[PDB]
Amino acid sequence: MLGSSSLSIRTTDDKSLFARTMDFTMEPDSKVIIVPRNYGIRLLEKENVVINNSYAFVGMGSTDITSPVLYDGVNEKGLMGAMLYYATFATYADEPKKGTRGINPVYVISQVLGNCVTVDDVIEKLTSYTLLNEANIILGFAPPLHYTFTDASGESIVIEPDKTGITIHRKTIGVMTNSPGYEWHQTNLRAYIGVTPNPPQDIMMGDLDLTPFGQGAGGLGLPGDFTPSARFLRVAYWKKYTEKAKNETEGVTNLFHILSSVNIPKGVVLTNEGKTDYTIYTSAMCAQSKNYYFKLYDNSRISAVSLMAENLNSQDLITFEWDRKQDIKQLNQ
Amino acid sequence: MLGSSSLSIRTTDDKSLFARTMDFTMEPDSKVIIVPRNYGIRLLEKENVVINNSYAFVGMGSTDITSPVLYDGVNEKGLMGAMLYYATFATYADEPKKGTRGINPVYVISQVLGNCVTVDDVIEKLTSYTLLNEANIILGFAPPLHYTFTDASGESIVIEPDKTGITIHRKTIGVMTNSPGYEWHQTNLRAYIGVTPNPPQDIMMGDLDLTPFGQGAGGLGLPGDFTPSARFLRVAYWKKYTEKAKNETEGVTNLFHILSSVNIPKGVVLTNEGKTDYTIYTSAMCAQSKNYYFKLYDNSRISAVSLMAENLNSQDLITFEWDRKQDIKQLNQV
Amino acid sequence: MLGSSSLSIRTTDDKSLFARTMDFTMEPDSKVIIVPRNYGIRLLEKENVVINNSYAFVGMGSTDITSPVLYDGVNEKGLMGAMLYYATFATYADEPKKGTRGINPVYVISQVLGNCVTVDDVIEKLTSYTLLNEANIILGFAPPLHYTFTDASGESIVIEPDKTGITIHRKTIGVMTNSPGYEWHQTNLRAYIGVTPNPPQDIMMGDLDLTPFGQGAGGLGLPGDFTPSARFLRVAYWKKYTEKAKNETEGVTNLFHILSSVNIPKGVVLTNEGKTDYTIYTSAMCAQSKNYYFKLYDNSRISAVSLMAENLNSQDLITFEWDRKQDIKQLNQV
Amino acid sequence: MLGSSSLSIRTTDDKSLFARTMDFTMEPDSKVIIVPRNYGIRLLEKENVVINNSYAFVGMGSTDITSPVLYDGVNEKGLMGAMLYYATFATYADEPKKGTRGINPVYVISQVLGNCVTVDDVIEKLTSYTLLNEANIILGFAPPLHYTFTDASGESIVIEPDKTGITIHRKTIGVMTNSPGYEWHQTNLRAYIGVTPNPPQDIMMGDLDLTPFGQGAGGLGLPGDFTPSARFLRVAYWKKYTEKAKNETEGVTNLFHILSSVNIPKGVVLTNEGKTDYTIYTSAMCAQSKNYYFKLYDNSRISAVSLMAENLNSQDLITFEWDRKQDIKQLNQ
């Protein structure tokens, strides 16, 4: 994990959808995963302590350690959520606070999705855990994360494990990328309210008449780079000005169009080490249907996994593998 | 038409691909159109003169007037091309210059793809015509246009009907959006050479340590808006830096990722007249395969049409309709 | 007041200097004021408590209300400070927290310059005060303010009356404009670390060589408008790269070159109400010499006042009136 | 030279004024020079044809080579001009075109100010010349230049020795910096018409109010760096919107304020060669008064030279040296 952009939206259909890109430096073995009720998810990768999960859920994630790790997903009661990179800000403890258990940052999404309904449930659950510096997701240090959640009702929150403790932001705008903290970007929005769909008025310099080249000059000032702050502003503004989605499909379509302003093609961003950082997949999920939708760097065709289609009291993890090949429809031979 | 961005690329296995977005306010009757050889293409809509085309070609276009109007396409000899808005700059004439025939701007692609092989053929071809200020029932007036072509060998040209006459640009960088002129954008590139994939180095102010938020800071300065100038910069720069495609399928994919930085969602851009200006479709062509690929605002799955698959001596236009339904694959019952 | 930019610097001379532009819609009655020892400063306009001041100071201010109101200044012990706008963020009590005295935001600088020596004294003094929502008759309301101070040693702090109470920021980078809060701008700096004095290297796009138009391209990404946030970046970044000053005089000069990046011409910024927001004056002060220097919108020649040349036990304010006529040295008859 | 910004303005007092910064790496020997009538100006350093100047002028320049080289200046008939850097564009001949006299690029201002009145006079003058690729000794080589002139009527033209020959632009907006060519910057202007003094309206995102930080948001998008294109934008836009000067003195004041957005502190721009590039002097001249005004990097106090005060039929050049000392006025000691 190395960067990502997310947002949620509300349809006129009365549905809530959430979506996110994921950026990274290669493809990992990642599938969409359906975790059945009562499966058991650890808190710490170093202790064999299991929490029985009341709920089933589906999302993108890894099976590379003991309990499924979910980057995002939706559960059978309509809770949607994700974890996103939060570098230089994320701060964790060595020891739990008296009265809490240790949890690995990498397990937050799975635990919550499996045991919560509303955004208030999330806030409540969280006060019974301390995020811990557990080394060895055999992928190293606990990655610097922060979290967003959105429930069936359309409310979004952000949880950020800062130096000064856990920060909750309630009733947010339903946008989140990477560092810095949420209130920093919310404040940043203010510097860019002049970014609109509407063209500016022609002007004169002496005798000279000045008019735009074409269209789209309203957005002058919007940065087009892929830093977390730039991405934050493109998702928010294009969330603001994109037409309301009138049903679930349109919602998926509109989410992927907005995220398209923050999709990273392979080669245009390199890391301090010269690894390439690119959008591996984009996904979306609907609280009311509990459908998971996703598309990949190598596959523009959207796939869909339906949570309630499966037997939720299954003993076993149900799994779908990525199809990393451009799914082109041939209209003739 | 109302805006669009385009580029070409080269693969590792020596294939040339060209791609474009089409931005518009309505989205009208448009389809893929295969024009066969010897179909006959009008020069002017108010006149009965028809040039008989030597080559078959496929591209997106309209069948609403006498001859197919192609917005872009590839022909059987591997020439690719496209017309794109050129507002404020496109200048035409009332009457043909001595020794040329008039041509309607919306017929250029069709005429060229129908009769040329190399970009040099295109340049020579063009000195026997004069763009005329005609007009069409569709939009109600001659649209301000400029044109781009790329042949099998990956060489690109831009043709621009300027106030002073027709301006040719030879061996271009293979990127073109809208106004202004090609020389203006080529010159503009230089103000932006500091936009790279590489992070800037940490610095200090007094006792502060300052380091980037995440990744991507090497891009500081690139603009994010949907003006033609900004779109050019984004397509040019991201063309430079994203990976070389290893084959044809990767070409289409990469082209669409790059164009993605200039895809316009419904509502983010409005005209003076309050109309929403958004990307209706996105297409890519391949000189060697002569395949035509496309996706739409409501359908992200790519479709393909093979020109060489059809009877190239057909009497009748062959067409493929837009499938404006988001084509979701269900991996279980949805 | 309606905007302003400020910074401090240290010479290789072991001197500290502070300087600020002042941006406002019209020029009230302002001059440079020397407040002598034991003069007396009110805390509040509606209450009659007058706090006796231990120290003399000089700076820019108004004499329109009961006690001299200073916008910035330096005192006889080398404490330097200023009040600047903090719109939408400043928050005041109706009523003092138990066991503090109420203080009008507009008296904070005069109270502090009068009774403090170090950065720590300022912090301590402030916990004995509570900022109240008391209006004044120059403006009609309590203007939203924040404050910066710099002592003889060169430490700088920012003090910000936030919703949740007074926020203190210790040993800052020595720059401060307007809203938002200090942490936010400090964080904002990280997004621009790639803004440097050095040019980026040429690149090629295919056959094309791309080189800068001239000099200065290292700064690509720096915004040029006059919002508080853009002014912070320019002053901070140009404070970083500007040559160290070798003595007091060069320190004044450097301060005003840097501040020139954020000097606002009449007409270029207008308020929601159409009043023009422009840089009325620019000042500087040195902690070691206790000299105050200023120039005006209408007069770029620098004037200087020396606190310690006066009698610090004078009965009365000593004041120097602005000279609003461009002070042009005639080199021959004009 | 390695940069200059320049503009002209018109007061409501019916006076025309012209101003320019000059940016360089170290200050060579320059002063204000008054060139009297009939003093004579060389065309080329390597040939002794001297052209007799009808008119007296005053400008900043150098006395290091045979004839005075002025960098800018105004003449006794109200014609004002400057030569600015034109790197990578300026093209000069090896040989004078059939029926022209060769001229050293560095002598254009001096020759033009010495014999022209209107911008038309200057267009006709220059087409009797060919700019020649002849080296000079204060800088070592032939510097790539272009030229701006403004006559007493307030019309401006820009002359640029392009690849394809001398390009001429009639009645320009009265702004000029460095490369690229005039028509490129004029076209660039259209991209930035939404740059105004006015704040954008407040907006909302969901339940959140968004309002500007303070003032000045109207200018969002304007670049702040010191390249020539950015320098052009700022000078033009700030020239459009800063208030009309009511007289000659305000004209000067306003000119230097607009020019201050393009003033370069020592250290914020370094060349490839690690040399620091900075604003050495800022000057202004008035067509009606024939006054010349200047301030320096080290002295923001403005100085003035009046052309007509002198004997315009003097035997010798009259000059004034720079005072690179901050001229502080002591209000008490």
From Swiss-Prot, chains A, D:
EC category name: hydrolase
An MF annotation (GO) of this entry: penicillin amidase activity
Entry note: thermal dependence: Optimum temperature is 60 degrees Celsius. Is very stable at 30-40 degrees Celsius.
CDD domains, alphabetized: Ntn_PVA
Record-listed E.C. numbers: 3.5.1.11
Catalysed transformations (reactions): a penicillin + H2O = 6-aminopenicillanate + a carboxylate
Active site annotation, chain numbering: S4 (nucleophile)
Activity regulation: Hydrolase activity is rapidly inhibited by lysine modifying reagents.
Biological process according to GO: response to antibiotic
Pfam families attached to this UniProt entry: CBAH
Propeptide residues per the UniProt entry: 1-3
Phenotypic consequence of S110C: Slightly improves the specific activity. Has little impact on the substrate affinity, but exhibits 12.3-fold increase in catalytic efficiency
Gene3D superfamilies linked to this entry: Penicillin V Acylase, Chain A
Effect of T63S: Slightly improves the specific activity. Has little impact on the substrate affinity, but exhibits 12.3-fold increase in catalytic efficiency
Function noted in UniProt: Catalyzes the hydrolysis of penicillin V to 6-aminopenicillanate (6-APA). Exhibits high specificity for penicillin V. Penicillin G and other related compounds are hydrolyzed at less than 10% of the rate of penicillin V. Among the cephalosporins, cephalosporin C is resistant to cleavage, whereas cephalosporin G is cleaved at about 1% of the rate of cleavage of penicillin V.
PANTHER family: CHOLOYLGLYCINE HYDROLASE, HYDROLASE
Protein name: Penicillin V acylase
